[PDB]
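Researcher: I need the complex structure. Ligand is 2,4-dimethylphenol. Inputs:
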Amino acid sequence: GFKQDIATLRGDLRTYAQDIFLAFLNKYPDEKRNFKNYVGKSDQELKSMAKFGDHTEKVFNLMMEVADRATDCVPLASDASTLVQMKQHSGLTTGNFEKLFVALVEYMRASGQSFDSQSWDRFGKNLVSALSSAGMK
Ligand code: HEM
Ligand SMILES: Cc1ccc(O)c(C)c1
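Model: Output:
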């Protein structure tokens, strides 16, 4: 289920983080309006860029902690308020998060592994709700 998937992802986190973020950017190319230094790069070139690997790993490190602190795929209000208040998220709306979790769920469905994709769909929907409640536009 969801808890085992956190452990699976954590066991190879930099590859999963990079591959899921690339699935997001490739499905939603307009989302590079928030990632201007990733324009004009293939996936293998992005994986060679220090902040791409570093920042994406740090994003997924925190995402896995928010998932681990959740109950039944519902994140803590304190985690939602952290993600709204972060200065690096000043430009963002809940639709940015919705698209990330659509891509993450599609990535899990396409894998041969027994990911609990429905739980990740719920977690994304519940994180978007918590972000909206905590004041993200
Ligand atoms: C649960 C989901 C998310 C988590 C846990 C998260 C967490 C983080 C963390 C930890 C950082 C700091 C990275 C660093 O400085 O090394 C960061 C920066 C950032 N996040 Fe988020 N984030 C999430 C979702 C999103 C989404 C959906 C977007 C936009 C589509 C986004 C856009 C950014 C941007 C633009 C930065 C700063 C630019 C950069 O670090 O390259 N984040 N995020
Ligand atoms: C959602 C997301 C994924 C990776 C990454 O580097 C940043 C900054 C955000």
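Model: Summary of the prediction. Helices lie at 2-10, 13-27, 43-47, 50-69, 77-85, 94-110, 117-133.
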